[PDB]
Amino acid sequence: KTFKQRRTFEQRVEDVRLIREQHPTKIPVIIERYKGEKQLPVLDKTKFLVPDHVNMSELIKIIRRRLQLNANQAFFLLVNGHSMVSVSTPISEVYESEKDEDGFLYMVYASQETF
Amino acid sequence: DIDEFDLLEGDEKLPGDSELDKTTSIYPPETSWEVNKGMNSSRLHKLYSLFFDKSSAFYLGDDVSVLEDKPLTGAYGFQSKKNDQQIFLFRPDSDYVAGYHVDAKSDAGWVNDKLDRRLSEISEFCSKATQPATFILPFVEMPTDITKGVQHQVLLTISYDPKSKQLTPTVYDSIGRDTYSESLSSYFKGKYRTTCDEILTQSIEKAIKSTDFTLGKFTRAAYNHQNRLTEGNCGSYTFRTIKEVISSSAQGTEVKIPGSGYITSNSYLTSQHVQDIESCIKYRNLGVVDIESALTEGKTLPVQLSEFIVALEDYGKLRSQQSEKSMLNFIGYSKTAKLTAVELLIGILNDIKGKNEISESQYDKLVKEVDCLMDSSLGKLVQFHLKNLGAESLQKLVLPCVKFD
């Protein structure tokens, strides 16, 4: 069901290997919902494209926008199994940090910080 | 873009001007309040949060535990740790009101329908009670045949002993100023009503009349005759007396009172007690559900960062709204300096709450404003929250959250 199951590693690798410079700037991101997350809506479009100078803040803002709720209920974005103590990090440095072997930067979201 | 959600809402919401007498869901910080400024049912209810705080002068947790059930509507149940005594504290209600006529020739006046409803419910609970119980209801009494009447704080207690099936009313009354008039007293040449005792006792008898119960001696226990108090203070005495009644009832001792057993009024309502009351009302932001939570589970309510923010918004609103006498050869910070510091701090705290992060120049600005944040009334507010948030200071509060460079 997750994007790694729907696209093979090879397929993913050629997705990343070029959508990369038909938006040379941009960085590819798969945002999915935590499987055991009972309290949050499932937004569907998995594959996202983001501008680089952008920090995690704004990304959290837009995902908080397509999720239709009010900024006043807990939202957290984890990157791999790992995530920010700093929301001011540009998505570029985050990308160079936590990117997957297939070239996509993976993120999962929840109303809680659980394991 | 710049502002996304710097919005102060949800738990950072400060109620608006027109929501001022209409909001029962939340008791907001009133940062200019003082004991002298009086009570209403919302402040009283707010004060109830002190009972299970182990650091409060009002802590009950040694005397009572919480009732396992909720047998009495509108009331918080408690079981004595030293007794078989169950103790019920009615949640304060603005409709608990009795009017009386000052003129003895007129009738005794009236009791609000909700108060009479409560008396009936107490009676119906007693008819089924297998255990000695105490019921504590705060209320107010007012003269209805004079103009310019004052609503006078007062407290009702009823005990029920199932063995003798006896039900004993008592009213604790902290005497306020002008709760009596020599002019009236002289004009009526002594037949004069200064209290709701007549209609209230009639009410209680009307409530128990169909049952097996005997009515005990009705007592009005009055205190602070001359310690001559504003109406305002009397509410604080009421709260103190709620405390005394609960403890005395759980220890099964006579309720002791200024003028009977207490040597002075401020040995009773103590400067520590006053600071507790004042700090609760001025500096805290508390839900009704949170208070019901505390009282029904028997636990403290820890101060939350959002309360610090909301308190700051209230101090800010008050000073920006008003126009002070602007005086001369002035030692200390100007209004403008203080409001700039408050606004800075609100922004920083809200950034910490939402983003869990603070820019280093932000921290630098804060550091520049800290002395002004620490000064006078504002200083007392900040110090309350620093203390209860477990921080030695603004710097040491904010600093784990700053991103350097």
Numbering used by the authors:
A (entry chain B): 5 to 119
B (entry chain A): 25 to 429
Paper quotes:
L. pneumophila inhibits autophagy by injecting an effector protein called RavZ into the cytoplasm. RavZ functions as a cysteine protease and irreversibly deconjugates mammalian Atg8s from PE to inhibit autophagosome formation. Unlike Atg4 that cleaves the amide bond between terminal glycine and PE, RavZ cleaves the amide bond before glycine. As a consequence, the RavZ-cleaved Atg8 proteins cannot be relipidated, leading to inhibition of autophagy.
To understand how RavZ recognizes LC3 before extraction, we solved the crystal structure of the RavZ1–431:LC31–119 complex at 2.5 Å. Nevertheless, the structure of RavZ in the complex shows a well-defined resolution of flexible loops, which are missing in the free-structure. Importantly, the N-terminal loop containing the LIR2 motif (residues 25 to 48) is resolved in the structure. LIR2 of RavZ interacts with the α2-β3 loop of LC3 instead of the canonic LIR-binding site that involves hydrophobic pockets located in β1, β2 and α3. Further analysis of the crystal contacts between symmetry-related RavZ molecules (RavZa and RavZb) shows that LIR2 of RavZa interacts extensively with RavZb, involving the α3 loop and the β6-β7 loop. Comparing with the free-RavZ structure, the α3 loop in the complex moves ca. 9 Å inward, suggesting a dynamic nature of this region. It is conceivable that the crystal packing led to a low-energy binding configuration involving interaction of LIR2 with the α3 loop of its symmetric mate.
